[PDB]
Amino acid sequence: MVLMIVSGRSGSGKSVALRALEDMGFYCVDNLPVVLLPDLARTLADREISAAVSIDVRNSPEIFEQAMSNLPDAFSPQLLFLDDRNTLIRRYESAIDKESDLLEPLRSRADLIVDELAEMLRTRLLGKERELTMVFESFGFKHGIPIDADYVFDVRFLPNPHWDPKLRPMTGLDKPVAAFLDRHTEVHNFIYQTRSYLELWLPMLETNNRSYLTVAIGCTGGKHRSVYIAEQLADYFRSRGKNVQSRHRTLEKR
Amino acid sequence: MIVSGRSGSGKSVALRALEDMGFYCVDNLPVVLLPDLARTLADREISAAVSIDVRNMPESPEIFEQAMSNLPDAFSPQLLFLDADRNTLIRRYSDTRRLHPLSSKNLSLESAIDKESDLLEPLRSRADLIVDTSEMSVHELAEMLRTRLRELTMVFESFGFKHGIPIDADYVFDVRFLPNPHWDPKLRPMTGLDKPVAAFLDRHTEVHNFIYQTRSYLELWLPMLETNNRSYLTVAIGCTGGKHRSVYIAEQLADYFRSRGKNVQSRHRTLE
Amino acid sequence: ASMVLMIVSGRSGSGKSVALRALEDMGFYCVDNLPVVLLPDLARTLADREISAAVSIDVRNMPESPEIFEQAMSNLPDAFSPQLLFLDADRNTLIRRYSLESAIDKESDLLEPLRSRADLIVDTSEMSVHELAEMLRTRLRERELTMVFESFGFKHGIPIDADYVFDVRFLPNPHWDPKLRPMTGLDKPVAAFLDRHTEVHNFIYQTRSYLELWLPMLETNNRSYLTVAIGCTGGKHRSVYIAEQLADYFRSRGKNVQSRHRTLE
Amino acid sequence: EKASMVLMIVSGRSGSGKSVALRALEDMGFYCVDNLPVVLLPDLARTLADREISAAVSIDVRNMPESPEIFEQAMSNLPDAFSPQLLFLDADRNTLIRRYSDTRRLHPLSSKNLSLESAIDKESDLLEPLRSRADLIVDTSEMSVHELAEMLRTRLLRELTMVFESFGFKHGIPIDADYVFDVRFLPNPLRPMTGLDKPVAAFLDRHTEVHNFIYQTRSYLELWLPMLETNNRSYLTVAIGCTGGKHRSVYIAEQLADYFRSRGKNVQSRHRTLEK
């Protein structure tokens, strides 16, 4: 029932961290006043789940220590701090100067600073391996089914990007193809329903000593629909704390 | 300001704008602890915004009302509600996350959205205003809320075009094509308020159809005009002299919208 | 009786579909690509309805020998007076309208008979869909009621000559998107923005529907002008597009209308 | 033996993109006639029969006879060689409104409609006869015009055969498979027996998780079966795989067939391992 406290300069990705903790099951409350930190736990402790809160420029150490010190035994507090200028500007030094001054009480006593960045948080809260690896690979039926695939799903019935002719040389990773497929509802239903189906058996497939679970998504060419769906399916289970890798057999000279 | 709505309805952009406006915005605060929050800000003397979604909904309306009963006299007790048609929300949802990371497993994406609305009916049913973001863009909801950040008074005024159209008028209706009461020089000195002129125009069906169609046309936009920060909606009925036809119609239009529980005022510019 | 049969012909890309569409607005029953042999049969079906008809004759539809045209033409009921229209545009222009050049010559060659027997010929090299629209209307007058649709900004005041004024300041705003703030309602981006919102279509539809209810009664007493003022705040975005769309609508209704944007002048 | 051609009937509400279909159908070579009166539909066909070319005609609010009986008369008394096929395009009510240019009347030869949404509804009401008897429906609500062009051009307008095959992974994945499901986590069965044998059947039937698996998998396929039935593909091959291809995989495929066979689908089962 940890109380992961998320801190860091404005633009360092604390909003992304809170989202990650949200995926794990933590109750995330943004910009809550520090004084009411006990109240949240007491209200949430009964639910028997962990919680995470954000403390930034929006959110005097006496009240700070007092409020943190004023806390139920059930929940054990942990404090996190995130922290480059050229990168921070991209996420967004008159603002930084006050920000730098204000990042000292907690920063000096911070557990981690933590300065690829998306998944990195998974490594933080343990995780790794001795666990099942989920492989999501795209392929084209004209080239054949990957030899190692365990599940194969045909997506050639979905809307085709070979209909906006400015997309034929693009791949499923390119944002235009993403936006094209994203506007269609059946694409969202397929991703949702396919992973929902896999989650029904994912606890049962984890048994024994399975080393790999390879799910192959197939369209005709293996460059447009299959690539995008496989990546979107992979990204879903990453939010679920799984160890996954995606591989696009056609987009690697084959 | 309480921001609520189905997943994908644009609550995240509202808070960002509202926070930009200067509000203290807190996401996912438990409803019971909403009063406690207010007391902390009272000294600072600033408004606040909070989000209530499927995560925060008590699924028991008493607790919401209970929190309301203990709510301090402060500036911010207003409720905002955003929504969208189901299929648009589905398009907005990036498929790389659970929709209810803290609830059961939803059977279908349209089942999750319906159940979301079903359990979120209490707050909507007693919601101040709804916003159908179905056609609003990413950037459009920002300026709409920024720009949008008492009730509307309907003014029905008759006038004569020969003196000019009222400066404050929002809608102007020309009624100089209607049957003329000057075809009865008994009525030439009488006004539209006098019962003889009323019965004369009432006997003609086209006048009642005009009033019916005119009030019907106004009612089409009246809910959308009521949501603006309009202090007045001025509807001007104009004939040539401003004494016969125009006067009578304004009387009937006012009387109708007054019957609908609307805030109305009547003014006959020429007869004053 | 006395119903018409306007036959529209011309090379592919000369705009017969736009002419055919215009005749449809007037009330014509328009049939595209009907085989010439069935021209009498079509008329007989419409005779009971007592309406005029218009048909297209192209290279796809053109028969192999002119005799069958006259045979079908002669075998059409007396009630119907046939009239033939022929459109032709510049050689290069048709290609732009379609989206070979030797084939286009053959198209002209195969359509020599109808051009020789055309009642009226109209070049469409310089015309735009509006220009040909009123061109057909003119062939089918003057000294009538003139409908003026003018946009204005309420901050500047109401046009003095306005008969109806409609406030549109409750509709979606284009000044929201910071791309469109320097654009006007005439600019295609603002059109697409407002076109995307359904309520804009309903306001235009319902406003013109309301005016048609009283338009016959407003026509009398030798009224020379009916001025409808559409007003937003600045008079450059919403009011311009709505007023322009309203004017364009009644043009299809066979009315004489003018649009004028007080702020954009 | 005999030769036969087609008459594609294009219908749908104003703004649903039937005009694009006719342009596409015209590109393929169809003789396309817009707004032809229904009564003359046979008469038109007779003229084209000799030329031996296909034909396309549009039936919208202008053409529908209000009395639906008249349509059937033309269809029943229609000359042979021409096989009627019906296409119907539709879109969302609010979506059609956005597509509607306001510079022309929507029903230019019918009594004026009360509201923009009443006309679209009445339009739908009057086209229920054609919609109910449509061969294929296309919802254009989410597609632009140019993709609707290429979608129809790419598409042709056959009844679909669903293949359920069991296999063993040690021998390889079937080349012809379209969907593949791994069932190697299910309760394991009997070593010389095959999945067709009732003991292996009763063994797997005894486990409830098998019933949950079949139910969830075929329910999953039904989500896409309407979209796959209208995709010109002649075969949909669903491969169920266990390790040996004789025990678990065999039993699941047969029950999937029996379900879709009970559902009136064209199915065949083939067990790759039990043939060597």
Author numbering:
A (entry chain C): 1 to 59, 63 to 86, 88 to 96, 113 to 135, 143 to 155, 157 to 282
B (entry chain B): 4 to 152, 158 to 280
C (entry chain A): -1 to 97, 112 to 152, 156 to 280
D (entry chain D): -3 to 153, 158 to 189, 195 to 281
From the primary publication:
In phylogenetically diverse bacteria, the conserved protein RapZ plays a central role in RNA-mediated regulation of amino-sugar metabolism. RapZ contributes to the control of glucosamine phosphate biogenesis by selectively presenting the regulatory small RNA GlmZ to the essential ribonuclease RNase E for inactivation. Here, we report the crystal structures of full length Escherichia coli RapZ at 3.40 Å and 3.25 Å, and its isolated C-terminal domain at 1.17 Å resolution. The structural data confirm that the N-terminal domain of RapZ possesses a kinase fold, whereas the C-terminal domain bears closest homology to a subdomain of 6-phosphofructokinase, an important enzyme in the glycolytic pathway.
The refined model of RapZ-CTD was used to solve the crystal structure of the full-length protein by molecular replacement with the two previously collected X-ray diffraction datasets (space groups P32 and P3221). Four subunits of RapZ-CTD could be accommodated within the asymmetric unit of both datasets, and the calculated electron density map provided sufficient definition to manually build secondary structure features for the NTD starting from the CTD-based core of the tetrameric assembly. Overall, unambiguous electron density throughout most of each subunit chain allowed residues 1–281 to be modelled and refined. Areas for which electron density could not be observed include regions connecting the CTD and N-terminal domain (hereafter, NTD) of Chains C and D (residues 153–159) and a loop (residues 99–112) that is disordered in both Chains A and B. The same loop is, however, modelled in Chains C and D where the density was unambiguous. The overall topology and structural arrangement of RapZ is almost identical within the two distinct crystal forms. The tetrameric assembly is composed of a dimer of dimers in which the NTD and CTD form two homodimeric pairs. The CTD forms tightly packed dimers in a manner that exactly resembles the dimers seen in the RapZ-CTD structure. Interestingly the overall assembly is asymmetric as a consequence of flexibility in the NTD dimers. Moreover, the quaternary structure comprises a domain swapped dimer-of-dimers formed through the interlacing of the subunits. The crystal structures suggest that three distinct inter-protomer interfaces support the RapZ tetrameric assembly: the homotypic, symmetrical self-interactions between the N-terminal domain and the C-terminal domain, and two heterotypic interaction surfaces between the N- and C- terminal domains.
